[PDB]
């Protein structure tokens, strides 16, 4: 691939100028070794002071791998890089991927380093390996080839990839293959033994066209909007009925026809919260009619590819996290719940970071893009710690929730 | 002639769309012109500048100034205009090392590189932009026109390009001599090591040998400064460091300017002098932009100052960093949102100190502030030492566990141990998860007229207890909290409270222990006195008994 693809920023936009955040010594050392080798292989070059741009860099360890890996935070460069239609008017996202019984995630970002990056654009990929305590200037580099995590890399490489895959796709018409950034998502409806065979029979095919040996296995079988459920009880206290009317009043914003009049009627007076209240027939029927309403899907829910996906997360305690993905309030496109996050029964922030990564993966599989997160955490705590538990090659956007939402209860 | 290597040129451009400068040269006196001609003839002989013709259309004004004992005219080329038009550079100097991160060095040499500076050539395609003109005597001949061949002093790119050029020249020497450290500041170059003065002097000669490959001569700095090095506001001693003398002035009149400088010194001093505090002195500046406004000191600002003078009465010093020892960070609560800390490796030998002040906000609590202080110190320690310290915190292990298991946000603090140093951070109240059997149930409500500001707050209970209080100059939100306050005041040690106020729930669920609202503070004081409080929420105007009753009582 001698010919470079002309790339430009968007009109009236300079390159990124993002501060490098401080790194521990062990991550600095890991990055020095990695970048020394990349430089010997020609993937990056030392740059001079006439280049004022910068994108942050850090070091991670992929899911269950002891080898340090370099991760560049290209979020700013990606939003400044021209919108891309490298080959066609767009890649219609495969609605069939989310329906497949199993989906395996392959890191193919190494393939990018075989394509040269347009020489006029290289300066915008500048990054700095920082020094400890400013005791030496940072090491300054730019990319000479398509970098991992950049928007343009899958776009510029798409002509090459579609050809590397066509033989495999030609024989397996029922296997769905989707690429998002540095990742290939390979899905099928067959028992894993053949699946891991096909998967291993895909990377080998890839190895003969020029890898990693890592995979991530999913089952979009169980992905929908979780029903709102109401308690089933033989004796209701005042407190129980108050919590029920509250939940039903919240649900009435999502569902038409929810009624609470007959249930509210039970609370006629000024009763002790622990007092048992017998349900009337009218109240039981109303509750029954509410249960029915809540069995059907929400009215007029549709994905609009022009709008952002928004992901909200609630800490429920004891290792449990609930989340909703939507574009418009009360029109959830997906809800879910996580329990017992792996490797952090005593660390909230690690659990939140893994939940953010799982929700992002689900979002890529369903819609082919990442949501904007609303995180139940103070900014300074999140920004101090999340890079410590990040294991993905992409990074989504996020904002912080500082006021406790009343609705955490309703997803309980 | 011994061939020398050229210093690699940095290519430079003007900002997109901009041309070079075209500033008119001012008239100069005959005396100044004479001086400038002499100065420039000498710079021209040294290769720093070259004569050019009148084809070049750019120009930057030049001036002649002097010192008062110094018996000469000085030359000044004002590159303000050219700097506005020059591309930005990677400014590789902004941050400096913190002394507490430095490691002890037995021997340190200084080398003057002021002359190596002029060996750094300016990009040839950029020189034209540096043209200037010496006006002629009596303006009767063409002005003498020159341009720079070297990095001009005063030009936007000279510091970054000079430092980058030296770094690249020095890199092979530093890489192959890992038993020395090399650091550059202005025209000075500092070389430290733990070698005997003999091998150390030998590395210096080797470094001199190395720099000669680029024709760079480097003698020792004039009037070798005995320790400590005065540098960036510090005193770098061979085995200790501190800030330069902190002297608080004595005054009976303090203006808005005085109090700003006092905080500056105090903030600077707080990196080694433990327990410095600057709230009460900062509070006297909340919002002003005029600087002689004599602001009297509160009895609390005076106390704070006097407390600082005591801390500053004697000099204190930090130690340098020992990589083979643990790194320990200890925090104390000081009051009024203020926090202090010490970072050390051996007890009583601080590497450095610091402070943290609560963020601006309507409500807050001590555990959130402590958490924030921990993240600040974590980030500072990664900068300075490349690692997180072990924390010693004035909060019990059980208190922290209760906090983070129950708090609605995710939160984390890294490896830490309890240090029993009062005052201790604690949870002041904890709400119940379930309604309390046998406890009276208060249904509270409040309401206010938007126009008249008249309102009512009150409660009704399952025992028939009732209260409605009329209020003036109030709001819906304030009557809603006032109703909760009355229920707390009038109930026993255990109480169930039912509100429809999402506003009040949002406040209390945030678990504040102090507020800028006196009413919230009064509610906090009540909660602290209770044994058990269950707070339940219901939606307004849905016929919820008790809520319906009190709602009508307070709504006119
Ligand atoms: C080497 C150096 C010098 C300075 C001075 C500026 C001024 N004006 C600044 C920095 C950042 C330097 O850079 C590094 N300095 C250190 N450590 C220091 C070395 C100096 N001592 C003080 C001292 C020691 C011995 C003598 S003595 N016995 O020769 O009289 C005199 C003074 C404190 C620790 N470590 C590193 C690591 C990477 S860079 C760097
Ligand atoms: Mg009301």
Curated annotation (Swiss-Prot), chain B:
<feature type="binding site">
    <location>
        <position position="187"/>
    </location>
    <ligand>
        <name>Mg(2+) 1</name>
    </ligand>
</feature>
<feature type="site" description="Essential for RT p66/p51 heterodimerization">
    <location>
        <position position="416"/>
    </location>
</feature>
<feature type="binding site">
    <location>
        <position position="112"/>
    </location>
    <ligand>
        <name>Mg(2+) 1</name>
    </ligand>
</feature>
<feature type="binding site">
    <location>
        <position position="551"/>
    </location>
    <ligand>
        <name>Mg(2+) 2</name>
    </ligand>
</feature>
<feature type="short sequence motif" description="Tryptophan repeat motif">
    <location>
        <begin position="400"/>
        <end position="416"/>
    </location>
</feature>
<feature type="binding site">
    <location>
        <position position="445"/>
    </location>
    <ligand>
        <name>Mg(2+) 2</name>
    </ligand>
</feature>
<comment type="subunit">
    <text>Heterodimer of p66 RT and p51 RT (RT p66/p51). Heterodimerization of RT is essential for DNA polymerase activity. The overall folding of the subdomains is similar in p66 RT and p51 RT but the spatial arrangements of the subdomains are dramatically different.</text>
</comment>
<feature type="region of interest" description="RT 'primer grip'">
    <location>
        <begin position="229"/>
        <end position="237"/>
    </location>
</feature>
<feature type="site" description="Essential for RT p66/p51 heterodimerization">
    <location>
        <position position="403"/>
    </location>
</feature>
<feature type="binding site">
    <location>
        <position position="500"/>
    </location>
    <ligand>
        <name>Mg(2+) 2</name>
    </ligand>
</feature>
<feature type="domain" description="Reverse transcriptase">
    <location>
        <begin position="46"/>
        <end position="236"/>
    </location>
</feature>
<feature type="site" description="Cleavage; by viral protease; partial">
    <location>
        <begin position="442"/>
        <end position="443"/>
    </location>
</feature>
<comment type="function">
    <text>Multifunctional enzyme that converts the viral RNA genome into dsDNA in the cytoplasm, shortly after virus entry into the cell. This enzyme displays a DNA polymerase activity that can copy either DNA or RNA templates, and a ribonuclease H (RNase H) activity that cleaves the RNA strand of RNA-DNA heteroduplexes in a partially processive 3' to 5' endonucleasic mode. Conversion of viral genomic RNA into dsDNA requires many steps. A tRNA(3)-Lys binds to the primer-binding site (PBS) situated at the 5'-end of the viral RNA.</text>
</comment>
<protein>
    <recommendedName>
        <fullName>Reverse transcriptase/ribonuclease H</fullName>
    </recommendedName>
</protein>
<feature type="binding site">
    <location>
        <position position="480"/>
    </location>
    <ligand>
        <name>Mg(2+) 2</name>
    </ligand>
</feature>
<feature type="domain" description="RNase H type-1">
    <location>
        <begin position="436"/>
        <end position="556"/>
    </location>
</feature>
<feature type="binding site">
    <location>
        <position position="188"/>
    </location>
    <ligand>
        <name>Mg(2+) 1</name>
    </ligand>
</feature>
């Amino acid at each position: 691939p001698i010919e470079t693809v002309p790339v430009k920023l968007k009109p009236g936009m300079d390159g990124p100028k993002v501060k490098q955040w401080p790194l521990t010594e062990e991550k600095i050392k890991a990055l020095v070794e990695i970048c020394t080798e990349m430089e010997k292989e020609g993937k990056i070059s030392k740059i001079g002071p006439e280049n004022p741009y910068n994108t942050p860099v850090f070091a991670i360890k992929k899911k269950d791998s002891t080898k340090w890996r370099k991760l560049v935070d290209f979020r700013e460069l990606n939003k400044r890089t021209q919108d891309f239609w490298e080959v066609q008017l767009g890649i219609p996202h495969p609605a069939g991927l989310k329906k497949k019984k199993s989906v395996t995630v392959l890191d193919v970002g190494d393939a990018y380093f075989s394509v040269p990056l347009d020489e006029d654009f290289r300066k915008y990929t500048a990054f700095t390996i920082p020094s400890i305590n400013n005791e030496t200037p940072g090491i300054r580099y730019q990319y000479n080839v398509l970098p991992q995590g950049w928007k343009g890399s899958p776009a510029i490489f798409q002509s090459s990839m579609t050809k590397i895959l066509e033989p495999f796709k030609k024989q397996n018409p029922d296997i769905v293959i989707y690429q998002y950034m540095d990742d290939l998502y390979v899905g099928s409806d067959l028992e894993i033994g053949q699946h891991r065979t096909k998967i291993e029979e895909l990377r080998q095919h890839l190895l003969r066209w020029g890898f990693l040996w890592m995979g991530y296995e999913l089952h979009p079988d169980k992905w929908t909007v979780q029903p709102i459920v109401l308690p089933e009880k033989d004796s209701w206290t005042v407190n129980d009925i108050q919590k029920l009317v509250g939940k039903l009043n919240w649900a009435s914003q999502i569902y038409p026809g929810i009624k609470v009049r007959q249930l509210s009627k039970l609370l006629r007076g000024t009763k002790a919260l622990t007092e048992v209240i017998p349900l009337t027939e009218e109240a039981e029927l109303e509750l029954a009619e509410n249960r029915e309403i809540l069995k059907e899907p929400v009215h007029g829910v549709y994905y609009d590819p022009s709008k952002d996906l928004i992901a909200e997360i609630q800490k429920q305690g004891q290792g449990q996290w609930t989340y909703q993905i939507y574009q418009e309030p009360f029109k959830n496109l997906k809800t879910g719940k996580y329990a017992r996050m792996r490797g952090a029964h005593t660390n909230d922030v690690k659990q939140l970071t893994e939940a953010v990564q799982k929700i992002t993966t689900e979002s890529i599989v369903i819609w082919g893009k990442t949501p904007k997160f609303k995180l139940p955490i103070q900014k300074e705590t999140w920004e101090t710690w999340w890079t410590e538990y990040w294991q993905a090659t992409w990074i989504p956007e996020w904002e912080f929730v500082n006021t406790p939402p009343l609705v955490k209860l309703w997803y309980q | 002639m011994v061939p020398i290597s050229p210093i690699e040129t940095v290519p430079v451009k003007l900002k997109p769309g901009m041309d070079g400068p075209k500033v008119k040269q001012w008239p100069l006196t005959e005396e100044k012109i004479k001086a400038l001609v002499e100065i420039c003839t000498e710079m021209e002989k040294e290769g720093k500048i070259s004569k050019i013709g009148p084809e070049n259309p750019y120009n930057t004004p030049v001036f002649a100034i002097k010192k008062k004992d110094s018996t000469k005219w000085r030359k000044l080329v004002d590159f303000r205009e050219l700097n506005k038009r020059t591309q930005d550079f990677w400014e590789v100097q902004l941050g400096i090392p913190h002394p507490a991160g430095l490691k002890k060095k037995k021997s340190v040499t200084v080398l003057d590189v002021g002359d190596a500076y002029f060996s750094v050539p300016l990009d040839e395609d950029f020189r034209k932009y540096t043209a200037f003109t010496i006006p002629s005597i009596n303006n009767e001949t063409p002005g003498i026109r020159y341009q720079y061949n070297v990095l001009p002093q005063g030009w936007k790119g000279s510091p970054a390009i000079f430092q980058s050029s030296m770094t690249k020249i020095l890199e092979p020497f530093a890489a192959q001599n890992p038993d020395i450290v090399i650091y550059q500041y202005m025209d000075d170059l500092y070389v430290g090591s733990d070698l005997e003065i003999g091998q150390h002097r030998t590395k210096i000669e080797e470094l001199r040998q190395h720099l000669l490959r680029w024709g760079l001569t480097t003698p020792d700095k004039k009037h070798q400064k005995e320790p400590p090095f005065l540098w960036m506001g510090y005193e770098l001693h061979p085995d200790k460091w501190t800030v330069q003398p902190i002297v608080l002035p004595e005054k009976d009149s303090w203006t808005v300017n005085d109090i700003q400088k006092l905080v500056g010194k105090l903030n600077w001093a707080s990196q080694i002098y433990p327990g410095i505090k600057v709230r009460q002195l900062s509070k006297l500046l909340r919002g002003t932009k005029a600087l002689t406004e004599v602001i009297p000191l509160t009895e609390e600002a005076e106390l704070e100052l006097a407390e600082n003078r005591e801390i500053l009465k004697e000099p204190v010093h930090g130690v340098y960093y020992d990589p083979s020892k643990d790194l320990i960070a200890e925090i104390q609560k000081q009051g009024q949102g203020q926090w202090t800390y010490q970072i050390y490796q051996e007890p009583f030998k601080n590497l450095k100190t610091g402070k943290y002040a609560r963020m601006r906000g309507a409500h807050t609590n001590d555990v959130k502030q402590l958490t924030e202080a921990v993240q600040k110190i974590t980030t500072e320690s990664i900068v300075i030492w490349g690692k997180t310290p072990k924390f010693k915190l004035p909060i019990q292990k059980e208190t922290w566990e209760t906090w983070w298991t129950e708090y609605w946000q995710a939160t984390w603090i890294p490896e830490w141990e309890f240090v029993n140093t009062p005052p201790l951070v604690k949870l002041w109240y904890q709400l119940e998860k379930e309604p309390i059997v046998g406890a009276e149930t208060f249904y509270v409500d409040g309401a206010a007229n938007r126009e008249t500001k008249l309102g009512k707050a009150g409660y009704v209970t399952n025992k028939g207890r009732q209260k409605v209080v009329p209020l003036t100059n109030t709001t819906n939100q304030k009557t809603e909290l006032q109703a909760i306050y009355l229920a707390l005041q009038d109930s026993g040690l255990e109480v169930n409270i039912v509100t429809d106020s999402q506003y009040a729930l949002g406040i209390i669920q945030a678990q504040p222990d102090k507020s800028e609202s006196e009413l919230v503070n009064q509610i906090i004081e009540q909660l602290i006195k209770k044994e058990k409080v269950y707070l339940a929420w219901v939606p307004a105007h849905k016929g919820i008994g008790g809520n319906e009753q009190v709602d009508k009582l307070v709504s006119a």
